[PDB]
Homo-oligomer: A and B are copies of this chain.
């Protein structure tokens, strides 16, 4: 879930930066956000549509 931002002057060394919960990691160095109503896949490379929620009969309310 983290992305790499390389420090200039040292290829080996890098900075790990965590991504927001709703963003997904498209490439090694950057992560993009899924669209509204979509949530990042467990791979953090895609988007799975969010289920539509409503009140149900079996709820305690």
A interface SS class:
loop
What CA separation (Å) do A5 and B7 show in the bound complex?
10
Q: Size class of A's contact patch?
A: under 10
- Mask, A1-26, CB within 8 Å of B = 1, is 00001011110110100000000000
Q: Which residues of B contact A13 (CB under 8 A)?
A: 7-9
Nearest-neighbour CB distance to chain B for A34, whole angstroms, equals 24
10 A-B pairs in the complex with CB atoms less than 8 angstroms apart: A5-B15, A7-B7, A7-B10, A7-B13, A7-B15, A8-B13, A9-B10, A9-B12, A9-B13, A15-B15
Chain A residues engaging chain B, CB cutoff 8 angstroms: 5, 7-10, 12-13, 15
